[PDB]
């Protein structure tokens, strides 16, 4: 079974690291493949990696055709990236991918309790995204589901792609 997954979300919010776990270099356009088994079904999952910068807004629609599931990411140490979910990512994805299931993914979960992150966000009167805030946003945009993960610690990563696969298969 072949299914197509596209991942989108703010620049540097952790998209490529999430794919790879399954360097400091921004992606322009890359493709990967992952094999996943869920519910007795074996799926060959094509992973379409995209650029999060607005510089590449006119390029991203090259990745959207015939998509089976969307990973829509933000980073838990970036409340800006969460605010960009309803402001930028959801309108774009729903414009180009109607009726495609969206997994809302909170990346970098390891930084929520990180003292350095909390100290640095504090200087800007910010704090890490709370789990409830992520879940509420997933509810708000009508996501297929909400998942938090850390590519760094691997926490929740397997669960993200299993959910994405089940979404694609359904």
């Amino acid at each position: 079974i072949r299914k197509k997954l596209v991942i989108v979300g703010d620049g540097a919010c952790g998209k490529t690291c999430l794919l790879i776990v399954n360097v400091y270099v921004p992606t322009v356009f890359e493709n990967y493949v992952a094999d996943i088994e869920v519910d007795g079904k074996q799926v060959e999952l094509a992973l379409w990696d995209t650029a999060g910068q607005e510089d590449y807004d006119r390029l991203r629609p090259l990745s959207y055709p015939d998509t089976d599931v969307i990973l829509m990411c933000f980073s838990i140490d970036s409340p800006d990236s969460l605010e960009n979910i309803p402001e930028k990512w959801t309108p774009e994805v729903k414009h180009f991918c109607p009726n495609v299931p969206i997994i809302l993914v909170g990346n970098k979960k390891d930084l929520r309790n990180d003292e350095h992150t909390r100290r640095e966000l504090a200087k800007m009167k910010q704090e890490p995204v709370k789990p409830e805030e992520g879940r509420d946003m997933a509810n708000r945009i009508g996501a297929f589901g909400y998942m938090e993960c850390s590519a760094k610690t691997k926490d929740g990563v397997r669960e993200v792609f299993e959910m994405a696969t089940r979404a694609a298969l359904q």
Binding site: G11, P26, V28, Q53, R58, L62, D80, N84, E87
Partner: protein, 201 residues
């Protein structure tokens, strides 16, 4: 309210610069702020700014050209993003399409020194207004690159995260995409070798 009605954004570059003040005030304001407070920000120009706040910054500037960023609470990525919006909203790209063709031709020259000299000759063909602003932005990006051990933004990374803003490329097909690899390289060269291209003693 709506950006169409702005007399500052989405209007020709020549209407928001003068011979006496060749850098748009908004661009000077954003870049000075970023140099003062943002040079140690990991992934400055890579990390996406808050889109809603970027638009808010633009509207507040519309209302008051004397807007004080040191006074407001816009974060560095918001200022960086709003700065990019100025260039993406220009009626025509900062680097004119006719110049991009000439730059691509120059870049194919195999001999390194000949290549760099050829690229500099193309610079002299830019409209003077565009040249001054292009110089200003590239020189800023070069200064950002000097702190790349901390902010991780090499000239390569800065090019990847800024050249389409400056050139407004055709991204309509895969073949069009591969044809843009030269643009990335060209802007990387202008940033890395900024002194050769833009210094005057």
């Amino acid at each position: 309210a709506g950006s169409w009605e702005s007399n500052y954004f989405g209007v020709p570059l020549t209407t928001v610069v003068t011979p006496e003040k060749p850098i748009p005030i908004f661009i000077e304001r954003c870049i000075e702020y970023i140099e003062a407070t943002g040079l140690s920000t990991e992934g400055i120009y890579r990390v996406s700014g808050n889109k809603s706040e970027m638009e808010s910054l633009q509207r507040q500037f519309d209302q008051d050209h004397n807007l004080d960023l040191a006074e407001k609470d816009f974060t560095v990525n918001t200022v960086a993003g709003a700065m990019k919006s100025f260039f993406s909203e220009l009626p025509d790209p900062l680097v004119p399409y006719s110049m991009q063709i000439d730059l691509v031709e120059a870049h194919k020259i195999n001999d390194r020194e000949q290549k760099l000299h050829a690229l500099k000759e193309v610079l002299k063909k830019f409209p003077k207004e565009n040249h001054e602003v292009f110089k200003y932005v590239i020189s800023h990006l070069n200064r950002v690159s000097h702190n790349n051990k901390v902010n991780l933004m090499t000239s390569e990374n800065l090019s990847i995260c800024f050249w389409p803003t400056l050139m407004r490329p055709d991204f309509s097909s895969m073949d069009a995409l591969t044809a843009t690899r030269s643009y990335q390289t060209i802007i990387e060269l202008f940033i890395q070798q900024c002194p050769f291209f833009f210094y005057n003693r």
